[PDB]
Design an enzyme around this catalytic site. Structure first.
Site, short mmCIF file in Angstrom:
data_model
loop_
_atom_site.label_atom_id
_atom_site.label_comp_id
_atom_site.label_asym_id
_atom_site.label_seq_id
_atom_site.Cartn_x
_atom_site.Cartn_y
_atom_site.Cartn_z
N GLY A 101 3.60 5.57 10.57
CA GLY A 101 4.94 5.47 10.04
C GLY A 101 5.63 4.15 10.29
O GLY A 101 6.69 3.90 9.72
N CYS B 252 4.56 1.15 9.47
CA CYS B 252 4.29 0.14 8.45
C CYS B 252 5.58 -0.28 7.77
O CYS B 252 6.41 0.56 7.41
CB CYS B 252 3.29 0.68 7.43
N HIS C 242 0.81 -1.23 0.00
CA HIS C 242 0.00 0.00 0.00
C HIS C 242 0.85 1.28 0.00
O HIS C 242 0.28 2.38 0.13
CB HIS C 242 -0.98 0.01 1.18
#
EC number: 3.4.19.12
Lengths: 300, 302
Positions: free
Chosen positions: A141, A143, A39
């Site tokens: 942040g 991820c 993503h």
């Protein structure tokens, strides 16, 4: 007893940052491939219903900013495997450790190296809940941060962070991009199922108590695996599997307490409570220490 | 909200193995100096009552075997600073990070990199108790393991491990060799002073419980600072200074609860108990989270 993470240095040397547009998350740099959540290619608008296949064909190698520190690594190839983006770079990571990608079972523990913009921030131990979520600390942040185990200098990567649910627990994939649990990588309503107690870990915790001389709860009873499984689910405990009995073997041998005798002891605790008494200095049973965690702390 | 240690990579690159006689323990290799506990020179009979200056003068550089992974490092000098031995070697550690030696205050936290035979095995958070012990996880061979904090790229070493008490708690020194607490490096039974609870840490942890959605312990009441400290001293909690109150400011402002309001809630908890409830999953009041530890994991992203 203490929750103990693995030393994070071998994973620290693999953390990079990956940017498309204004979206920056963490990536895992092993040999000449960087792994990150797919993503990163999404804008907020198509996060609502991503067509990842269509979004990816519109992306080129030159659309991906990969940085070790502030040093750009040139992308020479891109592909998508499940929910993970794989970015081939022109430099093989000289800090690549011996590693494997493994898919863990619920109840297993691993260390998480929380990262932000490619910089390691903290390391802590997580347990994969039976509902396939983890109770951790993941701010915006984070991820792309990974979870891992280390056995004799081999880093088994088992988790990559993607998501925080409404109840504050977190969810992600293995390093092949396959989500743990029924979660999809899109901004829609998603709910964690009902969680249960990790029975194999409670049994390990009782074994650790016995090793330390705290054994008032041992009884004269035994039970069959099936009878314990049927009783345990009535108390929202996980049923015991084959591999659960096997991985309790070393602790069963160390203490001389058969696995099924310990099951009868736990069964009595479920049915009658702890009548005020304590186990390892706690009137609460702990379910986030695996059998391997127990031998790692009670033995060398 | 959970206990989080600093990334240990910068410290892992400094851990080495130090051997003297039958004793093997860990050392900290910074630049061309390896620091390690001085009881590495003691035989098990020396341990019972060592005269360290006398035992050291009888040691040569060649009595110290230092190993960095597979390679041996040659000792070309040795000196003693309090309870820490400094072994000068012919090679400088290329992985030496920017570092400082600090002596931390009681109530502060730090990350411990447990090591065995110079190899790192685990990392976890520890708090310097008011009685100057720490509740760690240390086995045979863990001596020389260090505690540290990391600010940006600076590693602040504050602890080196030496001892386990009969009660199971642990004692050690700063990197200048001075013990935390009234302990000495000998094989003799030693107890610590009576431990007290770190009050400012309990409050920060109660705040974290609210930033994370758990509000059941709050109450509409308040208290003066002195009246809170009277109750706190009664329950063997450390005093709460105005400096502590100021430090909790960001946590107080981030939520909607004044510090003295939270003090009234803690006072009620101490007088009633938790009546079988939990706070942040725990059945007891946790005191090993500093206010700084709470702000970083509650919307800090550092």
């Amino acid at each position: 007893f203490r929750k103990m993470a693995f030393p994070s240095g071998k994973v620290e040397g693999c953390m990079v940052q990956v940017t498309c547009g204004t979206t920056t998350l963490n990536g895992l740099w092993l040999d000449d491939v960087v792994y990150c959540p797919r993503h990163v290619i999404c804008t907020s608008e198509d996060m609502l219903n991503p067509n990842y296949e269509d979004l990816l064909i519109r992306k080129s190698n030159h659309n991906f900013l990969v940085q070790a520190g502030n040093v750009q690594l040139r992308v020479i190839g891109h592909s998508m495997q499940n929910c993970v983006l794989k970015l081939k770079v022109d430099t093989a990571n000289p800090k690549t450790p011996k590693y494997k990608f493994v898919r863990i079972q619920p109840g297993q523990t691993f260390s998480v190296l929380a990262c932000y913009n490619g910089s390691p921030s903290g390391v802590y131990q997580c347990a994969m809940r039976p509902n396939f979520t983890i109770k951790g600390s993941f701010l915006n942040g984070s991820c792309g941060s990974v979870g891992f185990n280390i056995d004799y200098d081999c880093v088994s990567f088992c988790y990559m962070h993607h998501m925080e649910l409404p109840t504050g627990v977190h969810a992600g994939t293995d390093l092949e991009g396959n989500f743990y649990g029924p979660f999809v990588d899109r901004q829609t309503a998603q709910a964690a199922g009902t969680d249960t107690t990790i029975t194999v870990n409670v049994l390990a915790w009782l074994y650790a108590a016995v090793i330390n001389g705290d054994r008032w709860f041992l009884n004269r009873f035994t039970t069959t695996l099936n009878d314990f499984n049927l009783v345990a689910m009535k108390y929202n405990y996980e049923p015991l599997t084959q591999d659960h009995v096997d991985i309790l073997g070393p602790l069963s041998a160390q203490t001389g307490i058969a696995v099924l005798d310990m099951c009868a002891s736990l069964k009595e605790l479920l049915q009658n409570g702890m009548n005020g008494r304590t186990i390892l200095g706690s009137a609460l049973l702990e379910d986030e220490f695996t059998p391997f965690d127990v031998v790692r702390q009670c033995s060398g």
